[PDB]
Amino acid sequence: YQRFEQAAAFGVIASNANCVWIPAPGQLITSALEDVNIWDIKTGDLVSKLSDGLPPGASDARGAKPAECTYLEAHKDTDLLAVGYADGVIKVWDLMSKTVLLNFNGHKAAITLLQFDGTGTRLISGSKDSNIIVWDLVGEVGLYKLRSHKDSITGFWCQGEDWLISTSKDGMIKLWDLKTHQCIETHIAHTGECWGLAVKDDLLITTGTDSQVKIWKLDIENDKMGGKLTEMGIFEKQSKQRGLKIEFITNSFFYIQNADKTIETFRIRXXXXXXXXXXXXXXXXXXXXXXXXXXXXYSSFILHPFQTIRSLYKIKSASWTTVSSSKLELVLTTSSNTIEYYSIPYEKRDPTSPAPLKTHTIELQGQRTDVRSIDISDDNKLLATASNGSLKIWNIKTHKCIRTFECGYALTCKFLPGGLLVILGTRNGELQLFDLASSSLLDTIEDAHDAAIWSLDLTSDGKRLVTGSADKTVKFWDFKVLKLHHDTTLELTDDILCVRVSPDDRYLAISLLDNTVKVFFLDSMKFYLSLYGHKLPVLSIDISFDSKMIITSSADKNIKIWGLDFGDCHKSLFAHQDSIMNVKFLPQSHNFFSCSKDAVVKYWDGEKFECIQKLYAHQSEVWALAVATDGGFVVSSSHDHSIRIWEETSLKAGERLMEALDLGIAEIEGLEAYNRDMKLXXXXXXXXXXXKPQGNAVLIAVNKTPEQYIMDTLLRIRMSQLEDALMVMPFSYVLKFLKFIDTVMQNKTLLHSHLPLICKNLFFIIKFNHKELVSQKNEELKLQINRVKTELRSALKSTEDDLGFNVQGLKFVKQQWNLRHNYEFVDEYDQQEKESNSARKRVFGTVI
Amino acid sequence: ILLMKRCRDWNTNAKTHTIAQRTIRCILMHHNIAKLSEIPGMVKIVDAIIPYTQRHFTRVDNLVEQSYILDYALVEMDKLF
Amino acid sequence: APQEIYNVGKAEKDGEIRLKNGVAMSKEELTREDKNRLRRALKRKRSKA
Amino acid sequence: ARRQAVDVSPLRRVNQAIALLTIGAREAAFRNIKTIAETLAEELINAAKGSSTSYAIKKKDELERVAKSNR
RNA sequence: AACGAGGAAUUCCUAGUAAGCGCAAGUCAUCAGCUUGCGUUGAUUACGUCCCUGCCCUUUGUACACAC
């Protein structure tokens, strides 16, 4: 067998996380899948990647998709990059040592926000569920967990060490206390959720769902109801859409990023900047107090609208700097694996330019959209073909690209070995041939088809070509020297989705729009055979290198291996729980790699049809697959722009109360003799006392008082076990238990909580142990029972006076209503019949 | 009145009856009482409470009877010694 | 019998959860861990009946 | 598996006494010139004196001293 | 030559029982290298406990009161 492991992943420039910025012409750290990407803004190419030695398919990764780096945050003092992953695990990365050192996990969901301060060296994490967990990097223990939200965490701010402010994915905002571990105030923000939170020390800004921000002011007011956090202003006009992340920097500008390609920048002002504006508003109020209340209902006092920034791809992450307080520079990561650098000049008054400057762009190494098809040359030269038109030429030994072109709505690509030319298939009915040494648009045949083409293949010579389309046609093409021409077009019954030419150059299989695979003789077009029984249109057709067996699979998640000689089958194998997309063959052995929509690439054998290897490189869809013609490395093209290349290699009741009785009363007799010490110390002479005998560490860890710690063991003993575990206690502990009740009687609050339980327990011990308790002479026992009988009777009479008052008091309330509201009846036998009908009736099961 | 609806719920069991009996006594001693004489309309609901209290009155008075076993224990020990 | 002139039942309004032991929950104050516990308590009780 | 001394029921004291005195007769006249009638008279008379030469008295103080070694 | 009441390790057994003793029959299966009945003699030691090893049940009291 073999063990193939992935070498690297490419086109992973910007994943779904917030980036961070490094000073120096700055540097930028973005997110990758199971990695993070770090480069220069100036050059753009990678300088390092942060991962351990874990490839999927090896002993490290198991049967699950890898954790996407869904958040990262870096501090420039310790050079620690705290990354949040998709399964709630928390990793921290040394930048110079490129190694993870601590690996916590406390969340069951993906980590949304991370904010960590090196001033106390603490790490605060926020996930997609409610829990905010604060770790410390010096003790590696989850110190205090903040759990009061209901939906999620999306806002985040830590203010030293007494408060914490967070917003959830339902429109409500919390403030907690450090010391008291609980919340203080909650306040709803919007009807929908409040995504973004940016904080300056005076104002808190929170966006909503319908292009609405709320400007809130914090205070250190100790009032119970209000004044902790107020809601004076609402500003509008971001877009029609709403923001997700808001961030602010000083010399006094802040920005909000939407989901509709729109970053909006607004300027906040200060005291005299708004106080002169207040006089300007007072000049507006003069031109009763209608305008003054309209100046209190307002947002031009703080929010000065600077400008908006319109991108073309969906804006994902943004962090921004400023240089010399005149040029604010904004870094952007798009939906695609592309980086935008936006620089805006200002003189603290004017936007100074209509559009932001694109001084730095990273586009030449990503994928820019979803990649659709792959090409592998004979000497390991890769090509990638995407949807919007990025045909990129990659080399494995560099792990980089050479150049990229523009090629329309391209779908498929086949590589001609002769001259190293690339045949390209667009969704438009046209063909393209692109060269390496010369230019690209030499001879691109327009109007070759009407509808969308879906499959291309070629002969082993390369001079003959086939184009399968949804025009219910397949067209044969030949190259005459320097242009392609059509040779033979066959109409068919349905749309054609997958075409493969045989490596023996004798067969040409066609996947129709039905569940039919019809294979023709390549020499003659003579309708050799048809296959049927897939229940869905077939997406991938393969035949072996020696041309004995056909391997096909459709969207109904099964591989139905056929026989090329007779049209029989060998194995119908269900796998790949979403839908099977593509099948590729090893060029020397009967082995087929299946890539599918559920992010799994499986390697099977053609002689046992069991899973020999299972690959879990990523989590999104796998669009195409490719296998090298001589070596055997497998290239997988993903939906999230990933190119993975796989190079091959005890106690009992009664006893529990006894230890409770022995521990507490030795502590009780400990404090009793100590109380007699200070009565003999600080009264007569001086006398250096015992200086507080220490309580037990078992007592002080839970911090239960010794009367209480004995007491709840009585509740923990069950009701039928108590009568038999109370006679296992001998008379020496009986004298202790009488001393225990005489000490818990001094706290009347503790007695009345479980007074009938104490009454049942005490008057069973003394009832059973009566002969020893009476015929043992002790003045202390005479005093202790005298204290406990007079106090238990007084406590029982106190709770019996309340019961008997409520019985007699509310019987009066009943009988007063029964003469006031009740209209009584004179007719005695008719009244007693009516009361029997008006009385309560209940049904019970009986036996006659 | 809504507290008295919740007070009837707490009186149903035999552990929370001390809180339930204190709250009804709070209505008739600690509150504004002549105002509470004025207001009708709840008196059907308050009548469903009372035979639970008479069970709890008879149980507690039986516990007073079991508390005089100590009075026998103190007298007989004093007589013997 | 006094338990037959009132046997305590389930809550008259969906925002509360009454129980047989006389105590009563309310939905909008309960923690999600305890609400999941009371979900599991009512699930195995209804599976018994 | 430590030995722990426990006290003994009066019925068990009778049952162990009769079992040890009979075996003391049977083991003494195992292969000897004396028969069972002679040695049971020798075992019972020595047991009544507590003269520590019968098998039954020799097990009485041995089982106690084993129990006396760890109370 | 083996053999002086039988090693480790295992199995069974609570009263007309274990154990010992003879007599009779040979029942459409099974049994003569034995099987099945019928009598005589007739004990020790638990008859409690869930501590260990197992095996099962229960964890809304719903079967009507009281108690809990």
Side-chain angles (χ1 to χ4, degrees):
Chain A
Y1 282 155
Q2 269 94 6
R3 305 205 45 83
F4 33 82
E5 287 84 21
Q6 54 165 35
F10 322 118
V12 68
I13 270 175
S15 296
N16 295 320
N18 280 146
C19 58
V20 85
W21 178 81
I22 305 167
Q27 299 188 354
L28 174 73
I29 291 183
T30 58
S31 167
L33 311 179
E34 212 46 62
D35 212 310
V36 281
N37 278 341
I38 165 170
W39 45 63
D40 297 333
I41 286 296
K42 291 166 66 176
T43 53
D45 55 338
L46 265 299
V47 309
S48 55
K49 281 178 78 171
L50 309 192
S51 277
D52 312 341
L54 62 176
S59 305
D60 272 323
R62 289 284 88 79
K65 322 168 297 186
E68 169 145 19
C69 169
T70 177
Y71 203 79
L72 58 102
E73 186 41 75
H75 204 272
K76 314 170 195 205
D77 168 46
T78 49
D79 268 319
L80 260 177
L81 174 71
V83 282
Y85 278 111
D87 36 2
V89 304
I90 307 169
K91 316 208 182 199
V92 277
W93 285 79
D94 313 318
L95 257 69
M96 301 65 68
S97 190
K98 61 182 70 170
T99 314
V100 53
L101 74 155
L102 314 173
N103 177 39
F104 319 130
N105 40 353
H107 305 275
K108 284 155 295 186
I111 292 158
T112 54
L113 267 302
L114 282 166
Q115 196 39 254
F116 72 108
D117 299 349
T119 172
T121 302
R122 62 185 69 253
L123 165 59
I124 321 173
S125 171
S127 45
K128 279 208 70 45
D129 40 348
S130 160
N131 44 356
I132 310 178
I133 307 184
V134 192
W135 306 78
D136 54 338
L137 312 177
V138 287
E140 283 91 12
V141 160
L143 259 177
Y144 62 101
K145 179 164 136 159
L146 308 99
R147 187 142 198 270
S148 175
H149 273 305
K150 286 202 97 162
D151 213 78
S152 166
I153 296 132
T154 170
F156 226 67
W157 178 47
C158 179
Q159 40 270 48
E161 215 64 42
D162 170 288
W163 312 277
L164 188 82
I165 294 179
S166 83
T167 78
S168 188
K169 279 290 294 286
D170 67 312
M172 69 52 49
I173 311 191
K174 285 264 186 57
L175 178 133
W176 290 271
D177 258 343
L178 255 296
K179 268 80 66 178
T180 88
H181 217 156
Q182 218 210 16
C183 164
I184 291 184
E185 55 93 20
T186 195
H187 278 78
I188 82 180
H190 305 84
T191 63
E193 50 263 61
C194 40
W195 268 278
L197 173 130
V199 170
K200 207 189 173 292
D201 304 346
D202 40 349
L203 77 157
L204 179 138
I205 314 167
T206 37
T207 192
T209 52
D210 297 313
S211 165
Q212 178 193 5
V213 282
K214 275 188 111 91
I215 298 104
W216 284 13
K217 175 207 81 162
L218 270 307
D219 207 77
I220 329 289
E221 185 168 351
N222 307 323
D223 190 272
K224 38 175 71 174
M225 290 328 274
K228 182 60 98 160
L229 187 44
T230 180
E231 313 196 349
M232 62 305 287
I234 283 167
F235 185 63
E236 60 267 54
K237 197 62 178 176
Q238 323 169 352
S239 45
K240 178 57 208 80
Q241 277 299 124
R242 84 281 174 277
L244 301 107
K245 201 196 155 201
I246 318 176
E247 199 191 37
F248 164 76
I249 210 166
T250 72
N251 309 336
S252 186
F253 296 87
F254 82 107
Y255 85 107
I256 315 163
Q257 56 105 25
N258 294 316
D260 204 3
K261 286 88 62 182
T262 38
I263 282 195
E264 51 271 6
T265 66
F266 308 131
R267 169 175 189 264
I268 65 146
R269 306 155 168 178
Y298 170 71
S299 287
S300 188
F301 275 61
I302 303 182
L303 300 200
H304 161 264
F306 207 65
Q307 68 179 181
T308 57
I309 292 160
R310 274 88 46 201
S311 89
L312 77 157
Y313 315 120
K314 168 192 78 172
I315 44 172
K316 189 56 192 182
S317 154
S319 69
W320 70 305
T321 81
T322 170
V323 283
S324 77
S325 309
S326 70
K327 173 75 71 171
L328 60 96
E329 299 195 331
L330 159 72
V331 196
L332 199 146
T333 82
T334 81
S335 67
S336 71
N337 270 305
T338 39
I339 307 298
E340 311 309 306
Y341 202 91
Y342 295 153
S343 302
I344 294 105
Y346 61 98
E347 324 95 325
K348 272 203 190 175
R349 45 146 60 86
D350 202 273
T352 315
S353 163
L357 300 175
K358 272 88 71 185
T359 60
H360 289 86
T361 50
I362 305 183
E363 204 270 321
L364 261 176
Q365 272 74 41
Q367 200 54 255
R368 185 248 163 270
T369 171
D370 45 347
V371 63
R372 282 306 160 97
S373 82
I374 327 171
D375 261 326
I376 306 188
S377 159
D378 310 333
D379 262 344
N380 317 331
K381 182 67 172 135
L382 198 138
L383 277 98
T385 299
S387 168
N388 276 124
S390 83
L391 169 64
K392 206 163 311 191
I393 320 160
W394 293 72
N395 44 353
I396 300 112
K397 52 185 294 174
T398 319
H399 300 289
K400 303 305 292 159
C401 82
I402 287 185
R403 52 192 204 147
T404 324
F405 314 114
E406 308 203 326
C407 61
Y409 211 107
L411 303 185
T412 63
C413 267
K414 292 286 118 178
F415 190 81
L416 301 196
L420 310 174
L421 314 179
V422 195
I423 298 301
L424 194 131
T426 77
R427 199 156 180 168
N428 296 335
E430 83 195 353
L431 267 302
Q432 290 180 18
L433 63 97
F434 274 16
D435 307 355
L436 290 185
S438 52
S439 90
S440 275
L441 302 164
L442 266 77
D443 298 308
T444 78
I445 296 177
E446 322 171 322
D447 304 331
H449 276 97
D450 313 278
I453 81 170
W454 301 92
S455 52
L456 307 210
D457 215 17
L458 72 149
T459 53
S460 169
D461 319 322
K463 293 181 67 65
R464 313 212 64 239
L465 200 86
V466 59
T467 50
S469 322
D471 272 319
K472 320 209 312 166
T473 49
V474 284
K475 296 200 181 165
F476 265 88
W477 305 89
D478 64 321
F479 194 64
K480 165 164 78 72
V481 180
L482 282 88
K483 290 179 190 194
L484 276 160
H485 308 279
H486 87 286
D487 183 36
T488 289
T489 76
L490 294 203
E491 53 97 13
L492 271 185
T493 70
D494 287 318
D495 295 9
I496 296 106
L497 302 178
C498 185
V499 168
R500 202 189 181 186
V501 186
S502 57
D504 208 29
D505 314 312
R506 290 180 66 248
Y507 303 95
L508 180 128
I510 276 169
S511 79
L512 281 185
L513 204 48
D514 289 344
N515 45 356
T516 40
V517 175
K518 295 167 173 177
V519 50
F520 305 148
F521 281 166
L522 190 84
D523 275 324
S524 56
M525 291 325 89
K526 259 182 188 167
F527 192 24
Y528 159 62
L529 198 139
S530 171
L531 304 147
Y532 165 70
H534 263 266
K535 305 284 111 176
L536 267 190
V538 170
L539 312 178
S540 86
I541 311 178
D542 259 348
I543 55 139
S544 75
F545 47 89
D546 46 356
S547 311
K548 323 292 201 153
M549 55 155 177
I550 317 168
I551 288 194
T552 61
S553 200
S554 169
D556 67 316
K557 311 157 269 274
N558 41 44
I559 289 146
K560 315 187 171 297
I561 299 152
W562 309 110
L564 192 41
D565 45 353
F566 266 35
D568 61 325
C569 95
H570 320 305
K571 179 62 67 80
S572 175
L573 177 132
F574 156 71
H576 294 270
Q577 312 271 313
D578 201 3
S579 95
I580 306 194
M581 213 63 159
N582 283 118
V583 165
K584 290 304 148 196
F585 248 91
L586 269 192
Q588 300 100 351
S589 64
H590 289 307
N591 293 144
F592 60 107
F593 300 89
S594 173
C595 81
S596 160
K597 287 196 189 118
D598 53 341
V600 53
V601 169
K602 287 185 230 174
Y603 156 65
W604 322 75
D605 192 52
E607 286 85 7
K608 303 174 201 286
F609 319 114
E610 299 186 12
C611 41
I612 323 288
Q613 207 148 329
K614 207 181 299 176
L615 309 182
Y616 269 83
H618 57 88
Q619 61 268 19
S620 310
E621 208 270 341
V622 197
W623 282 117
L625 198 64
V627 165
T629 175
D630 50 348
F633 53 87
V634 191
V635 176
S636 65
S637 87
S638 166
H639 166 260
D640 47 8
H641 329 301
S642 197
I643 307 299
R644 318 277 184 128
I645 304 187
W646 298 85
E647 188 42 63
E648 48 267 15
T649 68
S650 69
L651 273 82
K652 187 59 73 71
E655 272 84 10
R656 273 192 308 277
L657 185 176
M658 266 178 187
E659 209 273 338
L661 220 59
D662 199 16
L663 263 191
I665 291 153
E667 280 290 327
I668 279 169
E669 270 145 0
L671 63 100
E672 158 177 6
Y674 182 50
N675 176 42
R676 293 178 293 172
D677 204 354
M678 321 275 268
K679 192 47 75 192
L680 260 296
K692 305 193 87 62
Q694 193 77 281
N696 302 146
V698 54
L699 264 188
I700 212 71
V702 182
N703 216 49
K704 282 197 214 145
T705 73
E707 44 184 15
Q708 177 211 357
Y709 174 56
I710 303 177
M711 152 66 67
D712 37 1
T713 49
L714 295 162
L715 301 62
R716 280 166 32 161
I717 292 179
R718 266 153 87 108
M719 32 186 79
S720 171
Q721 266 185 351
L722 194 42
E723 201 155 39
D724 219 341
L726 223 59
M727 299 161 317
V728 82
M729 282 193 95
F731 189 75
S732 169
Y733 294 140
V734 158
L735 299 183
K736 277 167 224 202
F737 183 78
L738 261 70
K739 191 151 198 155
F740 158 68
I741 297 185
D742 210 357
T743 51
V744 78
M745 202 46 257
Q746 302 220 342
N747 201 339
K748 198 172 284 296
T749 79
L750 263 300
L751 180 97
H752 280 114
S753 57
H754 330 93
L755 158 73
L757 166 69
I758 274 168
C759 162
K760 195 183 92 93
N761 293 6
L762 177 60
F763 304 148
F764 182 50
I765 279 176
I766 289 188
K767 189 175 303 189
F768 169 63
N769 272 288
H770 176 258
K771 213 160 187 180
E772 191 157 8
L773 195 133
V774 168
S775 290
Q776 279 203 0
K777 172 172 184 172
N778 192 4
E779 179 47 51
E780 293 295 320
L781 282 177
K782 275 158 197 178
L783 194 61
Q784 281 167 0
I785 305 171
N786 267 310
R787 265 178 300 174
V788 85
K789 180 198 63 192
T790 45
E791 277 286 331
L792 267 182
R793 280 197 307 119
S794 163
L796 267 177
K797 278 292 186 176
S798 181
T799 195
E800 187 247 342
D801 203 287
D802 311 333
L803 265 152
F805 160 76
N806 289 338
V807 163
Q808 288 299 318
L810 268 66
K811 262 291 181 52
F812 180 82
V813 176
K814 171 199 181 63
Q815 68 99 38
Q816 168 200 48
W817 177 88
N818 221 343
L819 48 92
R820 170 66 257 174
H821 289 64
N822 183 23
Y823 165 74
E824 279 291 327
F825 276 76
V826 182
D827 39 358
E828 169 66 37
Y829 291 106
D830 314 334
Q831 187 255 342
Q832 76 201 59
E833 275 176 70
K834 190 252 294 179
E835 291 326 280
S836 278
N837 304 353
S838 311
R840 192 149 182 101
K841 293 170 178 58
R842 195 45 204 183
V843 48
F844 316 101
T846 47
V847 166
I848 300 175
Chain B
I1 311 170
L2 200 143
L3 179 63
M4 181 294 308
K5 262 94 76 174
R6 304 303 197 274
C7 186
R8 184 186 55 185
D9 312 342
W10 309 327
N11 192 202
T12 322
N13 73 95
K15 280 220 178 324
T16 78
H17 87 282
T18 63
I19 299 149
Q21 287 334 285
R22 276 299 183 156
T23 42
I24 281 179
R25 199 188 194 276
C26 190
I27 285 168
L28 309 182
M29 310 295 178
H30 292 93
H31 270 272
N32 207 356
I33 324 291
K35 164 169 77 78
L36 292 169
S37 64
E38 174 99 39
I39 304 149
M42 62 305 297
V43 200
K44 161 198 165 187
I45 308 160
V46 316
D47 187 28
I49 303 186
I50 39 162
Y52 283 152
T53 55
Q54 270 183 358
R55 303 160 42 94
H56 303 336
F57 182 79
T58 319
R59 180 177 38 88
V60 161
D61 216 11
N62 199 17
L63 297 196
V64 183
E65 189 79 35
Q66 263 184 41
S67 178
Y68 276 88
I69 312 170
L70 308 197
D71 224 325
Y72 171 66
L74 275 167
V75 160
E76 181 73 32
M77 150 153 38
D78 278 349
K79 190 254 296 183
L80 210 60
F81 303 117
Chain C
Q3 59 262 42
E4 303 156 341
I5 72 164
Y6 190 163
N7 36 32
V8 85
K10 287 191 153 58
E12 60 267 350
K13 139 179 150 192
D14 73 314
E16 275 180 328
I17 299 183
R18 283 174 98 167
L19 294 170
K20 200 190 277 189
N21 46 18
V23 82
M25 310 314 73
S26 197
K27 291 303 293 204
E28 73 267 28
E29 49 91 16
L30 264 175
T31 81
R32 286 153 314 164
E33 300 321 290
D34 200 81
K35 202 182 296 181
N36 201 9
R37 182 181 64 84
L38 260 299
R39 198 267 315 250
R40 216 162 313 126
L42 197 57
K43 166 76 170 277
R44 67 173 174 275
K45 274 203 203 206
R46 285 161 89 160
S47 176
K48 177 170 297 195
Chain D
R2 186 210 35 88
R3 333 287 320 276
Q4 174 54 70
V6 282
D7 203 319
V8 51
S9 169
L11 184 59
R12 189 59 188 270
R13 284 179 64 215
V14 176
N15 264 340
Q16 283 274 20
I18 297 165
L20 280 174
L21 280 160
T22 289
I23 288 168
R26 202 56 67 95
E27 206 154 333
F30 204 50
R31 284 301 285 276
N32 277 84
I33 45 168
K34 34 177 70 180
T35 62
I36 316 292
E38 277 85 5
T39 172
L40 191 41
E42 176 67 34
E43 183 87 7
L44 280 175
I45 282 172
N46 295 333
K49 304 303 185 295
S51 63
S52 163
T53 181
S54 93
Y55 178 4
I57 306 298
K58 273 163 151 275
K59 287 294 283 188
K60 198 256 284 187
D61 53 357
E62 198 48 64
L63 197 51
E64 281 180 356
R65 206 257 317 277
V66 161
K68 204 179 53 59
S69 297
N70 38 2
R71 320 300 295 254

